[PDB]
Amino acid sequence: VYRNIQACKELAQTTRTAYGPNGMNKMVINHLEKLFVTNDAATILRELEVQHPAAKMIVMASHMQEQEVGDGTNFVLVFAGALLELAEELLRIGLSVSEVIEGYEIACRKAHEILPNLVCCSAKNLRDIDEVSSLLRTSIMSKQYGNEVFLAKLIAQACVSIFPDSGHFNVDNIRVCKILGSGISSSSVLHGMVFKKETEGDVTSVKDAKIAVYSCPFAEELMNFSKGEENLMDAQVKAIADTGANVVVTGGKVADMALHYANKYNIMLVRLNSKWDLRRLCKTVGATALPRLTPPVLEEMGHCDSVYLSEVGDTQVVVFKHEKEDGAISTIVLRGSTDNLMDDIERAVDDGVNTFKVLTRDKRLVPGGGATEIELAKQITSYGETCPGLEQYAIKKFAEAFEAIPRALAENSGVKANEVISKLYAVHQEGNKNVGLDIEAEVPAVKDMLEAGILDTYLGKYWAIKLATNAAVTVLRVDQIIM
Amino acid sequence: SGRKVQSGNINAAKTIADIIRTCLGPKSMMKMLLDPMGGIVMTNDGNAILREIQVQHPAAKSMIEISRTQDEEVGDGTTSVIILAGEMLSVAEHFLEQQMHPTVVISAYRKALDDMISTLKKISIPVDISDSDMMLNIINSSITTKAISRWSSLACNIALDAVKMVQFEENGRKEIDIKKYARVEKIPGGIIEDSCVLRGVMINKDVTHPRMRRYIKNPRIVLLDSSLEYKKGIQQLCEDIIQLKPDVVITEKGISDLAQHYLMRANITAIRRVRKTDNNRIARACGARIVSRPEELREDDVGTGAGLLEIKKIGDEYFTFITDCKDPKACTILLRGASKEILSEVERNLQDAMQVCRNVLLDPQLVPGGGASEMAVAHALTEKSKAMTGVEQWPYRAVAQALEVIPRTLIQNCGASTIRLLTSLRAKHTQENCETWGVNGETGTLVDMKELGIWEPLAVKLQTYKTAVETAVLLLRIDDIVSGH
Amino acid sequence: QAALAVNISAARGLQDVLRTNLGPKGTMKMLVSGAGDIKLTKDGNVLLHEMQIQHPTASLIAKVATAQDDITGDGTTSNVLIIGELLKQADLYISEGLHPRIITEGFEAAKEKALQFLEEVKVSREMDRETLIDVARTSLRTKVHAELADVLTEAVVDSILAIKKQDEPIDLFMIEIMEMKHKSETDTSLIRGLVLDHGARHPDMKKRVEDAYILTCNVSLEYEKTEVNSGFFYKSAEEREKLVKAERKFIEDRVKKIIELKRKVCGDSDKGFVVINQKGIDPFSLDALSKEGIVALRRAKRRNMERLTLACGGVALNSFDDLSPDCLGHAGLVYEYTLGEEKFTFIEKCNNPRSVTLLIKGPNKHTLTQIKDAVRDGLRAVKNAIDDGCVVPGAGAVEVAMAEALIKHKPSVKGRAQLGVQAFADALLIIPKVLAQNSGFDLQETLVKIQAEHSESGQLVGVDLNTGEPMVAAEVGVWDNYCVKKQLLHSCTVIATNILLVDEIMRA
Numbered sequence A: 001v002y003r004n005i006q007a008c009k010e011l012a013q014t015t016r017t018a019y020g021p022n023g024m025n026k027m028v029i030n031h032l033e034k035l036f037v038t039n040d041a042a043t044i045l046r047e048l049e050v051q052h053p054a055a056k057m058i059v060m061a062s063h064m065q066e067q068e069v070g071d072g073t074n075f076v077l078v079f080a081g082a083l084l085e086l087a088e089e090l091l092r093i094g095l096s097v098s099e100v101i102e103g104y105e106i107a108c109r110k111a112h113e114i115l116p117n118l119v120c121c122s123a124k125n126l127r128d129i130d131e132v133s134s135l136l137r138t139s140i141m142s143k144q145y146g147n148e149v150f151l152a153k154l155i156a157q158a159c160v161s162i163f164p165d166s167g168h169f170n171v172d173n174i175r176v177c178k179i180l181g182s183g184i185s186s187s188s189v190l191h192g193m194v195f196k197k198e199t200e201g202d203v204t205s206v207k208d209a210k211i212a213v214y215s216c217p218f219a220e221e222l223m224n225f226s227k228g229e230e231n232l233m234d235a236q237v238k239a240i241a242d243t244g245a246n247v248v249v250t251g252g253k254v255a256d257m258a259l260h261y262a263n264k265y266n267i268m269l270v271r272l273n274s275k276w277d278l279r280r281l282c283k284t285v286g287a288t289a290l291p292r293l294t295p296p297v298l299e300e301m302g303h304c305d306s307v308y309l310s311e312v313g314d315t316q317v318v319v320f321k322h323e324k325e326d327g328a329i330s331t332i333v334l335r336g337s338t339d340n341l342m343d344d345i346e347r348a349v350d351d352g353v354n355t356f357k358v359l360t361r362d363k364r365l366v367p368g369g370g371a372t373e374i375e376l377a378k379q380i381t382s383y384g385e386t387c388p389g390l391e392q393y394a395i396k397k398f399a400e401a402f403e404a405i406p407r408a409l410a411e412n413s414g415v416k417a418n419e420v421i422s423k424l425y426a427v428h429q430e431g432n433k434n435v436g437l438d439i440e441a442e443v444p445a446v447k448d449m450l451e452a453g454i455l456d457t458y459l460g461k462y463w464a465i466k467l468a469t470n471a472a473v474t475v476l477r478v479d480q481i482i483m
Numbered sequence B: 001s002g003r004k005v006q007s008g009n010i011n012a013a014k015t016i017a018d019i020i021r022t023c024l025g026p027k028s029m030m031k032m033l034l035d036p037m038g039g040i041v042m043t044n045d046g047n048a049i050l051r052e053i054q055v056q057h058p059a060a061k062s063m064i065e066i067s068r069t070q071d072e073e074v075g076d077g078t079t080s081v082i083i084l085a086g087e088m089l090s091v092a093e094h095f096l097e098q099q100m101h102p103t104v105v106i107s108a109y110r111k112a113l114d115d116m117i118s119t120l121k122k123i124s125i126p127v128d129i130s131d132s133d134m135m136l137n138i139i140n141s142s143i144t145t146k147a148i149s150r151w152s153s154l155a156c157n158i159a160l161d162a163v164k165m166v167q168f169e170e171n172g173r174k175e176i177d178i179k180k181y182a183r184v185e186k187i188p189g190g191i192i193e194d195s196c197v198l199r200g201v202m203i204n205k206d207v208t209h210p211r212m213r214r215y216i217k218n219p220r221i222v223l224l225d226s227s228l229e230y231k232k233g234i235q236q237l238c239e240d241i242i243q244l245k246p247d248v249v250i251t252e253k254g255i256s257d258l259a260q261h262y263l264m265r266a267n268i269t270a271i272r273r274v275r276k277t278d279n280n281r282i283a284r285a286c287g288a289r290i291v292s293r294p295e296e297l298r299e300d301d302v303g304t305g306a307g308l309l310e311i312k313k314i315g316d317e318y319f320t321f322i323t324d325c326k327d328p329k330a331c332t333i334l335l336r337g338a339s340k341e342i343l344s345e346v347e348r349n350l351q352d353a354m355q356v357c358r359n360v361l362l363d364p365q366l367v368p369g370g371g372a373s374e375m376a377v378a379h380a381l382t383e384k385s386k387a388m389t390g391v392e393q394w395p396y397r398a399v400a401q402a403l404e405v406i407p408r409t410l411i412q413n414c415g416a417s418t419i420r421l422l423t424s425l426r427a428k429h430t431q432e433n434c435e436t437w438g439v440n441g442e443t444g445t446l447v448d449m450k451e452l453g454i455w456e457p458l459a460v461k462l463q464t465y466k467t468a469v470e471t472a473v474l475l476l477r478i479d480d481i482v483s484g485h
Numbered sequence C: 001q002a003a004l005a006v007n008i009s010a011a012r013g014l015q016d017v018l019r020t021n022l023g024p025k026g027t028m029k030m031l032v033s034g035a036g037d038i039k040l041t042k043d044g045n046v047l048l049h050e051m052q053i054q055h056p057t058a059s060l061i062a063k064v065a066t067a068q069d070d071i072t073g074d075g076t077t078s079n080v081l082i083i084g085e086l087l088k089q090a091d092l093y094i095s096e097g098l099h100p101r102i103i104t105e106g107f108e109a110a111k112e113k114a115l116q117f118l119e120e121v122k123v124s125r126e127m128d129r130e131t132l133i134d135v136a137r138t139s140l141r142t143k144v145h146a147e148l149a150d151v152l153t154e155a156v157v158d159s160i161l162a163i164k165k166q167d168e169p170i171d172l173f174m175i176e177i178m179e180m181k182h183k184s185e186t187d188t189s190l191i192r193g194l195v196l197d198h199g200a201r202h203p204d205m206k207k208r209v210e211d212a213y214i215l216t217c218n219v220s221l222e223y224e225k226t227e228v229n230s231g232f233f234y235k236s237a238e239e240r241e242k243l244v245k246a247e248r249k250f251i252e253d254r255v256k257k258i259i260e261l262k263r264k265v266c267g268d269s270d271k272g273f274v275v276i277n278q279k280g281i282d283p284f285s286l287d288a289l290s291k292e293g294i295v296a297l298r299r300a301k302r303r304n305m306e307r308l309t310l311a312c313g314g315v316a317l318n319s320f321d322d323l324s325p326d327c328l329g330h331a332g333l334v335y336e337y338t339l340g341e342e343k344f345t346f347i348e349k350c351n352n353p354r355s356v357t358l359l360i361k362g363p364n365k366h367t368l369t370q371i372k373d374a375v376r377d378g379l380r381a382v383k384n385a386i387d388d389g390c391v392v393p394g395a396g397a398v399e400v401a402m403a404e405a406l407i408k409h410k411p412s413v414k415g416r417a418q419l420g421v422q423a424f425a426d427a428l429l430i431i432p433k434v435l436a437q438n439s440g441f442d443l444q445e446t447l448v449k450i451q452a453e454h455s456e457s458g459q460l461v462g463v464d465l466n467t468g469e470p471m472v473a474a475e476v477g478v479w480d481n482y483c484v485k486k487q488l489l490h491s492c493t494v495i496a497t498n499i500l501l502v503d504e505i506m507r508a
């Protein structure tokens, strides 16, 4: 069993450092030989060729946590790693695995009811852009750098507060579009799906339009052949331009003859269609892909509202806004020096918007920065003495497992871990729950988060603790398999 | 290297501690000695285990030496000292890998030692002095589980009379005791009941021809390292001795018959072929003085000693009885039997009880054995560490969690599970405030030691704990071994 | 001479591998496939079926053990442990002579005595809900998480109690387990009736069909055309492009025949005409029939069709006509359910209420499979308990009592068969020892406590697998199946004898 615990320890260690706002970003090369630099732990786990079946269980637990809450994945990883370390030392003491399992389950049950007793909930509602953005600050603060958080929070919140209707939100509604070039400050909030285009024969004031989707991207005898090709192409463009079609998209490049025939129908020619854009268009307007030119029909055709060229961002873009709901889709324009940092910002925006979605169904906020972890550790380790028997060891180890989060959050910030843990635990008796770990000072000092506004969601913490405990338990109940 | 040498030192400590970790308690396991000739030795004593084995690491040699020095100073507890030192040095591994300095660990260990001393002095049960009741109770407690159970009826009263024969009244109330000045008389032959006690020094040497005034009703002994010759042509020394008029003058050279007559002219009795370990106790019990320089010779050269001398040839061998000595600090104890294989052990355990008695004069205290004291002090530390903060709280708690090794091994070399029993023992030792239970060494079951009847002297426990802590801090203070290999 | 020793070693190794699974506190094992798929389970049958065993005779033991276990309910790991301990005890004496025939005769005599003793030990307690709850708990806590087992007990016992109304041994066909991948695994209960695997692409035919009639007969709204003419679209393209037509007329004729049947037997557009096809159907005719109240469905497997025949009724054939309504059946509720993206057809309150399915909503594949196997084992255990109408104490109990009976019966037998009897007894001692070991206690201490308590009590006493002290299984509620014990004794004796009788290994 120690082999499984060792494998899980290694996999937790490889992503332990990326935890917290000062996470050390790693270099990532995938099988098609790119070169990323990313601090997002879920991204690291994606490109890790994890083969050990024991660590696969923790990876699946992390995926479930992300699939349901969208944040705290690395918390699940590090918590499971600490739990397995302490379970391993308990086993080395001589305790049976069953007793450790029972103690862990009892401790998790205790923590789940202790947790809702230390909540300082949301202020009034998802509205009041400034306040709610202040709530959404910590996630983006941690996931990407701590500098441009003040602007990224406003950018990511102004877009999501657009449609707080009936208390229902969807992550896919808030889309992100890439526009390279200027710095991040030039980014803003826009409405409706956006990408590039080529031609300029576009009409701005458009009623419910008609989208054509192209799934497949584009001496007398020579003259007669040229005439035949020209007439066939003209027949095809007439056949695709029938039924009052107004906009056409294709995944290929432009042709002078093709754009000329499109413009002679007063139709713009849109090109540069990405491998991912067609499905998004089909789901957003209820359209379909047409393989060849010869089968166009009115029924197999989706509907947009407005199409025009926007010069925002020092470049020409197309807009497909005001869908059936007329406000459902809400994009975010991003500006950056290259595309490598574009992905980091989009992951930060996603890790903010999903926290907002979680907050929609739960207004409870919990003091982050290690405050809740140390509080839970103190509560559980105090409860441990009240429970005699063989489960006290496992309960105490569960408390020490909660102790690991501020430890990592400090040691990956250039601060002595033991010193800050001791100071935090000592202060936490009198300087109660709302105190946590300060990042700014190089000296191991502590700072209150209720004043500093460093908070994280209750539901995320609850689900992460539950899933991490379940993963540790289900990986402790395995004997071996031939490998 | 840095902390690598610390880890090596404490690894040698651990690998030498677990060698004898199993051979304590009333159910000690045996060990195998395989000398490079083929011989094999049965052994229960870890002291002989360490003595016979050979080691190459200086740390191990130093710990063996400290175990010895504790052995011949206070008596028993060497295995406990080694086990405790190994356990603390092993639990220091966790902190030495925290990249945190040995100095703060050392300070935490010293604080823990002070608190353990305090809580032992708090938990110790009092005992009476000069009372045979709980003296025999202590005999049943500690002087038992030895080879004395068949001869305890004699060992007990031998020790109980021997407690008042080596007292020095220097600075307080009978707080000074010296160890070798008790006149041991171990002679086989006859029945063991013939062993008795006498107030005075018992000298196995005697004059060749005792046809002279050997015994005088007030021996005023004078010591001299000079050699007695025929005459001046040395009678001059005898003539100078006549000046102060003594009756007995002790030398360390042979005496002839004509020399005997020359001495009895001055009426002084000399002795020959005596030992320094006899001369020193003679002087101690008699308060005599040795001087031969004529300028220093004054009225102080003669010091009155005993008040009655006697010679008895019990079994055609030359004894010398010096009873009613001036100072009852070096007095006769008699040993009789057939073989010295057990009487030596019974003797040594009796002077162990003697040290018990003198500490009872200092601190008449007993600590509950069978792991009771260990878990009591561990609970005291663990509840004490709650209030205190700082980065050194972890070693402070770890010392407490490490000192519970004694009950753990007592349970282990009994058959019963060492986990459930320890957990139950702690459970009935924290919330149960005024109990201080222990573990039975025989059956491996928890039992209140006030009922079982096992107790240990306070002083031996204090010395063991202090030596263990000092050994741990010493091995943590060594930063380099290198002066060569 | 040596082949016997090889077999002994292999059986001991297999026993050691399987040791840490017996008992509800046993630790599960993980089966990773060569492809990469992972299966985590503890049931003895699946472990022996899916393990990659290396030793040949160990593979033989596993094969015969699973083959015999397919007969009775379960008890495979206990059987393997008993075989291993029997072989070790026998070898302990074979090492000092004792031609194996003597040990075999001792084994058969001990088997006869143990069967007799089990006959006098069985409990003939009657039928009730609570005892079967306890039986389900015993059979389920040994396969899955404790709380999940407590959840599953009620559903399993209620399903079997409902099926029991026929007063004949019936199972397997009449209880089916459905597979789906809902995130929340707490949703698990009985669905009286039948649930179809999937529906069809249909915009709002009926939703709540309520009372309706079922005819099936594999409607041919996408009737087989004449596409196959010569290979593919060859130079003679007008065949597969034009002769492929004229079959839509057959589809429309089937549509009017369905119309005639509907407004002939139904009497109105209501009273849904439930039909299911094994192949696809065009959405056009689908919605055309839907507007008339016809419940048209497609793309189902066979097993659901034969299930419908015995529950509701109806012929099955792709090409059909206006047949008689004799095969038509009626259902109380034909409500259709949908969860996110997949659609469920709840054919409920039908005639012949014997057909009942169970609902499980495990999050991942391996948890789903584990729950399915645990449910199957619980159903088999409760079925056996109802069939024999007699149950025996678990947690050992019977093992130690049979051991005492055999030991007191040892002087009765003559010859050297006493050695075989003693070996058989010490082998039956393995089960309480394995339970105590897997709990975390000491082997011999717990065994001595159990035997001593049984000595002056007489009543069956077993191991309490949370504290280690002896417990009477009747009061606590731990029960085993009498038929399982019978098959256990028979199979263990047979396999141990067969392994002991061998003398030489040769290639072939």
Ligand SMILES: Nc1ncnc2c1ncn2[C@@H]1O[C@H](COP(=O)(O)OP(=O)(O)O)[C@@H](O)[C@H]1O
Pocket (backbone or CB within 6 Å): A018, A019, A020, A021, A040, A041, A042, A070, A071, A072, A073, A074, A075, A138, A139, A141, A142, A143, A351, A368, A369, A370, A409, A437, A438, A439, A454, A456
């Ligand atoms: N400014 C800060 N100071 C201290 N701790 C912080 C700060 N910002 C975030 N944290 C903590 O760092 C953690 C970051 O979680 P994160 O690594 O983003 O999880 P995931 O990557 O799975 O979304 C949060 O739980 C939060 O408590």
Ligand SMILES: Nc1ncnc2c1ncn2[C@@H]1O[C@H](COP(=O)(O)OP(=O)(O)O)[C@@H](O)[C@H]1O
Pocket (backbone or CB within 6 Å): B023, B024, B025, B026, B076, B077, B078, B079, B080, B145, B369, B370, B371, B406, B410, B439, B440, B441, B442, B454
């Ligand atoms: N009858 C007994 N029951 C339980 N423990 C005992 C008993 N007798 C002695 N002990 C334990 O033995 C320990 C000391 O034995 P040990 O150190 O091996 O002897 P020595 O001091 O001569 O080396 C004490 O801690 C005491 O608690």
Ligand SMILES: Nc1ncnc2c1ncn2[C@@H]1O[C@H](COP(=O)(O)OP(=O)(O)O)[C@@H](O)[C@H]1O
Pocket (backbone or CB within 6 Å): C021, C022, C023, C024, C043, C044, C073, C074, C075, C076, C077, C078, C138, C141, C142, C377, C393, C394, C395, C396, C435, C463, C464, C465, C478, C480
């Ligand atoms: N609650 C319980 N306490 C003690 N023993 C139990 C308990 N439940 C089941 N058992 C024991 O577990 C054994 C069955 O375990 P196992 O061999 O894994 O089942 P199977 O092989 O039939 O699938 C039974 O002999 C029974 O005595």
